[PDB]
Design a protein around this ligand. Structure first.
Ligand SMILES: Cc1cccc(C)c1NS(C)(=O)=O
Lengths: 237, 300
């Protein structure tokens, strides 16, 4: 069934599962034509497929050439997402295949179910959580590899860096969703928070800065402030 | 003109014969139904006055045998039976005819309703959906489940309709996932028509039989089958033109005959709105769309 606040700890048990977010698969800029009509220009996109227990991120880069000559691209994007997720599952050894795939948008349910008919025992589930994975393209290293791609490519990351050496996967996911929610609500401010102090750097093999335990508590507090504010600045409260 | 005689009517019952019905009182001198048109299947059906639970009945074709009804006080129902002795049966029917103890099948000469509802329905196909090979007629009731319902429990008492499932390997060619899901023409024309049903007449026959079981017995799984068979055609971009024209006629007469007060439970809002307004065939069912809009605009 659907994944919600009530069954949240299920994400961190030992049954392999993946979140799939398709919100950055089909990306466009909207512009005027010489004749004054409007047109779109696609830019490279990505499927965000994340194991929330381990942090493993399978970032499938969607190169704009996949849309060439195709119609109804927003519908096709859901099916292309499901095709790529099914291909990923088939590429993994049996003992690494997920028992459940949780889609962040309900419109992905039928495309993924149809593509996964060969895997009757993999449950395809929606969620009632409003997860902020669309903000993944605000992580500089992820945006950079997507924008530089000249062909379809899969790139593997650990979205938790080395956090699991010191914190649990529940705590790591909570930090990740807080950071992403902040980046989604006010990207400029969130990024200022994360980089303001130049003595804290991002390792070459990491996505986020090398904060101490104490600095993460401060950072996390700054992100919560940002989110509540914007929630005021927005609703005036 | 054929006759379905009755040994007696010991319990008060509403008896249906095709789209007609009449009330029979407990121990009323009723001895059956005469003047039944030859050339069609027929259904004789029953609802007891004391237990409107379980509508039940029998599909038959009088060309296949001499059939009669006798109430069984042990099993508590009117049972159809076959009399192998033709002279004895003709003699009994003649005696009852002379004593005017039979109702006449009350067909209006201008009226093609029953033909139109059973055009493609064949007794041999009914007997494959309802498996009871020792009898030439077929029992159906309100509670019988379908093979597909059982998969999701007694197999001998099941309705063996052709399983249709839009999210199944049968329906979806590997590598054509999006194409086959959004345009079901492959599944309709190759899998179902060429492969399973063999021709559109057999497909329409099963569609018509499912509707009739839904209408006359409130059989829920039959309603599901009827709607699935409609949706499979409407969700196919490529359908033979003669099938679309025939489907429009089939559905028109089904909607025309449906009791106005049963539309709430026997019509699926999603399927009908999709079929008439969103599907590939939204502009191909003119007669059905017109009768639906004038008789059940609320559903739409
Ligand atoms: C109705 C009837 C018609 C035809 C054949 C049989 C055996 C019967 N039953 S009876 C003779 O009443 O008991």
């Amino acid at each position: 069934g659907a994944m919600n606040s009530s069954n949240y700890a299920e994400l961190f048990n030992n049954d392999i599962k993946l979140f799939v977010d398709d919100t950055n698969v089909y990306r466009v800029t909207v512009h005027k034509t010489f004749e004054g009509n409007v047109a779109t220009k696609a830019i490279n996109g990505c499927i965000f497929t994340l194991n929330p227990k381990t942090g493993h991120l399978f970032l499938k880069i969607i190169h704009t050439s996949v849309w060439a000559g195709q119609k109804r691209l927003s519908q096709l994007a859901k099916w292309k997402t499901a095709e790529e997720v099914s291909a990923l599952v088939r590429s993994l050894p049996k003992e690494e295949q997920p028992k459940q795939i949780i889609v962040t948008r309900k419109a992905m349910l039928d495309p993924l179910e149809v593509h996964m008919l060969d895997f009757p025992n993999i449950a395809i589930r929606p969620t009632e959580l409003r997860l902020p994975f669309s903000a993944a393209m605000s992580i500089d290293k992820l945006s950079d590899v997507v924008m530089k791609a000249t062909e379809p490519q899969m790139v593997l990351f650990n979205i938790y860096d080395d956090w699991l050496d010191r914190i649990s996967s529940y705590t790591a996911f909570s930090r990740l969703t807080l950071l992403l929610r902040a980046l989604k609500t006010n990207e400029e401010s969130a990024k200022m928070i994360l980089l303001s102090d130049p003595t804290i750097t991002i390792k070459s093999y990491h996505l986020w800065p090398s904060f101490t335990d104490e600095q993460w508590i401060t950072i996390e507090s700054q992100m919560r402030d940002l989110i509540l504010t914007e929630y005021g600045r927005k609703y005036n409260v | 003109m054929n006759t379905v005689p009755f040994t007696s009517a010991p319990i008060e019952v509403t008896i249906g014969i095709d789209q007609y019905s009449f009330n029979v009182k407990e121990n009323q001198p009723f001895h059956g139904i005469k003047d039944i048109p030859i050339g069609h299947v027929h259904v004789i059906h029953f609802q007891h006055a004391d237990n409107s639970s379980m509508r039940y009945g029998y599909w038959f074709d009088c060309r296949m045998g001499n059939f009669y009804i006798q109430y069984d006080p042990k099993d508590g129902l009117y049972k159809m039976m076959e009399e192998r002795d033709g002279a004895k049966f003709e003699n009994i029917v003649h005696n009852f005819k002379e004593r005017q103890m039979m109702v006449s099948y009350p067909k209006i000469d201008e009226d093609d309703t029953w033909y139109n509802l059973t055009e493609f329905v064949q007794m041999d196909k009914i007997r494959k959906i309802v498996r009871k090979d020792e009898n030439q007629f077929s029992y159906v009731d309100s509670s019988m489940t379908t093979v597909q319902e059982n998969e999701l429990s007694d197999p001998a008492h099941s309705l063996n309709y052709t399983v249709i499932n839009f999210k199944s390997r049968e329906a979806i060619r590997p590598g054509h996932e999006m194409e086959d899901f959004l345009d079901k023409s492959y599944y309709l024309n190759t899998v179902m028509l060429q492969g399973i049903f063999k021709n559109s007449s057999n497909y329409f026959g099963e569609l018509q039989f499912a509707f009739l079981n839904a209408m006359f017995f409130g059989n829920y799984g039959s309603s599901l089958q009827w709607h699935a068979m409609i949706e499979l055609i409407c969700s196919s971009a490529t359908v033979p033109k003669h099938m679309l024209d025939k489907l429009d006629e089939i559905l028109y007469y089904q909607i025309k005959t449906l009791p106005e007060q049963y539309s709430d439970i026997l019509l699926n809002e999603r399927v009908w709105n999709i079929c008439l307004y969103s599907s590939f065939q939204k502009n191909s069912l003119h007669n059905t769309e017109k009768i639906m809009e004038n008789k059940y605009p609320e559903l739409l």
